[PDB]
């Protein structure tokens, strides 16, 4: 049931999504080990992901959460990186997309920093890098990220350097406590609490 609609680079919607991608790149403490060495991307394509069933599954859950949280879904737009973006856009998020070994337990992980999600595109810790060249810093191969609508509801705040949400909460927020420049990461424990809105195809760019 999924169709992908290409956005024109002239469309304000393309431009706002690209700006969120580019403006949330940061340096990582691994020196580029997992995700590569880059300060910016070459955006090749941005597609809107359209699936009625998956959208309705999302809005159903969103209303449930809103009703448990004084009519506030606490909805965010966040990045997700995974080798399984094709499964996600066709069948939705579910327990197979959970990061069993993550810092906040076995849930589905989303990032404010696009460059954090980039570290997961080829697998946990970058896996072995791109399929073709086995390079986690590949500047040739096309990568894909999802920019997703995520319902946080009442989020459990973890200060730091499928499972269930903490009791009385709908998500977990991982607040950076060491790296002053890192943005937050978020975990949900129900696939229906995220919709994969945009599929972004890109390359990382070699610094000049
Ligand atoms: N898979 C991801 O995009 C991700 C986001 C935030 C933290 N860890 C992983
Ligand atoms: Zn490559």
Q: Look at the alpha carbons of 181, 188, 48, 146 in this order and tell me if their dihedral is positive or negative.
A: positive
Q: Which residues contact 83 (CB under 8 A, 6 or more apart)?
A: 121, 122, 123, 127
CA 131–ligand 2 middle distance (angstroms) = 6
Question: What is d(CA 22, CA 32) in angstroms, rounded to the nearest whole number?
Answer: 16
* Domain 1-208: CATH class, spelled out: alpha beta
Q: Whose CA is nearest to atom 7 of ligand 1?
A: 109
Q: Domain limits of the chain?
A: 1-208
Cα(185) to centroid of ligand 1, in Å?
7
Q: Is 50 annotated as a binding residue?
A: no
- Other beta carbons within 10 angstroms of residue 189's beta carbon come to 21
Q: How many CB atoms lie within 10 A of CB 108?
A: 27
Pocket of ligand 1 (CB under 6 A): 79-82, 109-111, 116-117, 120, 185
Cβ-based neighbours of 119, under 8 Å, separated by 6 or more:
28, 30, 34, 35, 81, 125, 126
> Quick one: which ligand is closest to 116's CA?
1
Residue with token string 């910016």: 40
Annotation-wise, does 148 bind a ligand?
no
What is the DSSP secondary-structure string of 28-51?
Answer: -TTTTTTT-S-S-EEEEEEEEEE-
For this entry, resolution in Å reads 1.8
Which run of H or E residues covers position 156? strand 155-160
Q: How far is the CA of 14 from the centre of ligand 1 (A)?
A: 22
Q: How many Å from the N-terminal Cα to the C-terminal Cα in the chain?
A: 43
**Contact yes or no for 122/112 (Cβ under 8 A):** no
């Amino acid at each position: 049931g999924t169709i992908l609609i290409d956005l024109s680079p002239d469309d304000k919607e393309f431009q706002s999504v690209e700006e969120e991608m580019q403006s949330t790149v940061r340096e990582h403490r691994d020196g580029g080990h997992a995700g590569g060495i880059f300060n910016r991307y070459n955006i090749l394509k941005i597609q809107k992901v359209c699936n009625k069933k998956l959208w309705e599954r999302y809005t159903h859950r969103r209303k449930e959460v809103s009703e448990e949280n004084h009519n506030h879904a606490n909805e965010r737009m966040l990045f997700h990186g995974s080798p399984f973006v094709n499964a996600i856009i066709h069948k939705g998020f579910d327990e197979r997309h959970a990061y069993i070994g993550g810092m906040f337990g076995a849930g589905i992980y989303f990032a404010e920093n696009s460059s954090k999600s980039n570290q997961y595109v080829y697998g946990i810790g970058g896996g072995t890098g791109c399929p073709v060249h086995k390079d986690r810093s590949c500047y040739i191969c096309h990568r894909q990220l999802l920019f997703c609508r995520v319902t946080l509801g009442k989020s459990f705040l973890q200060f730091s350097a499928m499972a269930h949400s903490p009791p009385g909460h709908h998500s977990v927020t991982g607040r950076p406590s060491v790296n002053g420049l890192a943005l937050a990461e978020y975990v949900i424990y129900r696939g229906e609490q995220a919709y994969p809105e945009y599929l972004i195809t890109y390359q990382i760019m070699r610094p000049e």
